[PDB]
């Protein structure tokens, strides 16, 4: 077979605060992600934030770890694959420290700090992949899923500047063959929250300049693929648990960017399956019912 790095990217999967603490959408996604890993393979899973709804977790004794995470993603195959996690606004309404500390309890759960670098090598090749995991809440401010806010400006401006500066240096320095950036809030989205102004100003210009293949996010509760004039991909995967059919911000996204949107009210939701070979990164969007919805290809570039 083609030597490839394979991963699932799933966003906004954090169940509900009413027992049984999961939705049939979350369960369907867990079941389909398990089928995907088992038959197509995966090296890891990325969570794109909003891991526990509506106010994250309190501490490492929080039952939501068991009920919303362990009980749902319980297939032996999702347990043998590492998860790399970042936070959304609803995580920040609780204790993000607790989710970080959970890394010391669960072998598969990796959340070493709010933002961090990941480095992978495609097996049997020299082809490497960096993924920079961001905390867009501390970068941009709070943005409640169920209001139409722009994250105005961060609680701690110094921490926002530190993260942005760390990211600029990481991207400038990165020697990997593919570089991906991941965070909760969208740069571009046609949906309920739409483009995050903070990220359009602060993050977007880094992406093309440093040869970033794609930015991955969730926050808008749907599946989207967008691509800009520099060929940068926007993988939006926020349909692990809820669905939102809004196209409210369709006009706030530059003409020609949107390639694919799925927000159907009667969908079980879905996720993205990413495969990276020496030739291209492909992104396959998979509905929780098991249907392939969209596939797109991003050719390998000569990076700076
Ligand atoms: Fe969300
Ligand atoms: Fe969110
Ligand atoms: Zn249980």
């Amino acid at each position: 077979a083609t030597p490839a790095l394979r991963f699932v990217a799933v966003g906004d999967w954090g169940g509900v605060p009413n027992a049984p603490f999961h939705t049939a959408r979350e369960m369907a996604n867990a079941k389909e992600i398990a089928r995907t890993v088992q038959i197509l393979g995966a090296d890891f899973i990325l969570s794109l934030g909003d891991n526990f709804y509506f106010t994250g977790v309190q501490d490492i004794n929080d039952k939501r770890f068991q009920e919303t995470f362990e009980d749902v993603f319980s297939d032996r195959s999702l347990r043998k694959v590492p998860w790399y996690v970042l936070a959304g606004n609803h995580d920040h309404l609780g204790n993000v420290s607790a989710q970080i500390a959970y890394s010391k309890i669960s072998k598969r759960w990796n959340f070493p700090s709010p933002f961090y670098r990941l480095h992978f090598k495609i097996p049997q090749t020299n082809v490497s992949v960096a993924i920079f995991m961001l905390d867009t809440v501390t970068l941009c401010g709070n943005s409640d899923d169920f209001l139409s806010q722009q994250p105005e400006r961060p609680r701690d401006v110094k921490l926002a500047r530190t993260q942005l500066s760390w990211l600029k240096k990481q991207l400038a320095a990165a020697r990997e063959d593919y570089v991906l950036v991941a965070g909760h809030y969208p740069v571009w989205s046609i949906a309920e929250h739409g483009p995050t102004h903070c990220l359009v100003k602060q993050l977007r210009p880094l992406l093309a300049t440093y040869g970033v293949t794609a930015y991955l996010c969730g926050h808008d509760h749907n599946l989207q693929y967008l691509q800009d004039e520099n060929g940068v991909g926007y993988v939006l995967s926020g349909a692990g648990n809820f669905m939102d059919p809004s196209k409210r911000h369709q006009r706030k996204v530059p003409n020609g960017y949107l390639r694919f949107h799925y927000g159907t009210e009667d969908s079980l939701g879905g996720f993205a399956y990413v495969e990276i070979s020496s030739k291209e990164m492909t992104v396959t969007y998979i509905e929780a019912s098991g249907k392939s919805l969209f596939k797109t290809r991003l050719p390998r570039r000569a990076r700076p």
Side-chain angles (χ1 to χ4, degrees):
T2 294
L5 194 69
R6 300 167 146 96
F7 66 94
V8 163
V10 58
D12 301 85
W13 52 269
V16 291
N18 291 188
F21 313 111
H22 66 258
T23 60
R25 290 192 169 112
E26 195 194 355
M27 285 290 194
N29 280 291
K31 169 176 164 200
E32 188 60 25
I33 294 171
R35 282 186 172 266
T36 295
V37 169
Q38 282 184 235
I39 100 98
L40 299 178
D43 302 293
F44 61 89
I45 292 170
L46 300 181
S47 167
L48 305 171
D50 279 352
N51 308 308
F52 308 91
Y53 282 112
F54 303 117
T55 54
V57 286
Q58 178 184 5
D59 53 44
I60 60 153
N61 286 348
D62 198 312
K63 63 176 140 193
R64 289 290 302 283
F65 284 115
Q66 184 63 31
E67 295 304 306
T68 300
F69 179 67
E70 307 290 347
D71 279 357
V72 173
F73 303 95
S74 57
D75 185 285
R76 272 175 50 81
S77 310
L78 301 179
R79 290 192 62 252
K80 296 203 154 161
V81 74
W83 286 57
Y84 301 103
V85 181
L86 50 72
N89 177 74
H90 292 269
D91 302 300
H92 281 266
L93 298 186
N95 296 314
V96 170
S97 269
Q99 302 191 32
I100 289 167
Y102 197 71
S103 307
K104 316 294 210 189
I105 294 149
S106 164
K107 296 186 293 288
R108 67 169 161 177
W109 179 273
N110 299 272
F111 194 169
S113 59
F115 54 92
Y116 54 100
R117 167 181 173 267
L118 296 167
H119 173 102
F120 301 101
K121 185 85 80 175
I122 295 165
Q124 312 285 147
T125 74
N126 62 17
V127 183
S128 52
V129 179
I131 303 181
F132 301 95
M133 302 285 280
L134 303 184
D135 195 306
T136 61
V137 179
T138 59
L139 192 54
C140 300
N142 290 99
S143 175
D144 193 284
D145 282 10
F146 306 96
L147 295 164
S148 215
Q149 299 172 128
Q150 279 292 315
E152 44 192 58
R153 251 7 262 201
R155 168 179 208 160
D156 181 0
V157 186
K158 176 76 175 302
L159 173 61
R161 288 170 170 147
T162 299
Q163 186 180 176
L164 185 62
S165 180
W166 166 91
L167 175 65
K168 278 204 81 167
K169 290 184 261 189
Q170 290 287 7
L171 290 179
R175 312 325 304 152
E176 285 83 359
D177 303 279
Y178 295 81
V179 167
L180 302 183
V181 178
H184 182 62
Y185 301 159
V187 175
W188 303 116
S189 173
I190 67 150
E192 62 272 30
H193 301 290
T196 311
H197 194 93
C198 158
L199 299 186
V200 173
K201 307 199 274 212
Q202 308 276 39
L203 171 62
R204 168 189 63 122
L206 302 179
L207 300 179
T209 307
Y210 294 115
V212 178
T213 290
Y215 176 65
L216 285 57
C217 71
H219 195 57
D220 274 339
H221 292 153
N222 29 80
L223 301 173
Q224 299 172 57
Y225 181 74
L226 314 92
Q227 195 181 292
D228 72 15
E229 67 287 354
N230 297 119
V232 177
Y234 300 85
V235 177
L236 193 143
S237 182
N241 189 51
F242 302 132
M243 278 296 277
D244 188 327
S246 182
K247 292 191 180 169
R248 172 175 211 166
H249 287 96
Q250 197 163 0
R251 275 215 297 178
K252 302 308 185 194
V253 170
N255 190 245
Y257 279 23
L258 176 68
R259 300 297 165 90
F260 162 82
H261 162 267
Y262 187 78
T264 302
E265 285 107 322
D266 58 38
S267 177
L268 280 165
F271 58 98
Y273 181 70
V274 180
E275 302 164 278
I276 299 176
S277 69
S278 67
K279 180 186 178 178
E280 68 198 345
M281 163 165 151
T282 70
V283 178
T284 301
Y285 291 80
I286 300 172
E287 208 194 10
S289 69
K291 185 71 180 298
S292 272
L293 298 167
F294 186 71
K295 183 163 180 174
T296 192
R297 284 158 187 97
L298 286 153
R300 175 142 174 220
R301 48 170 92 209
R303 288 192 57 256

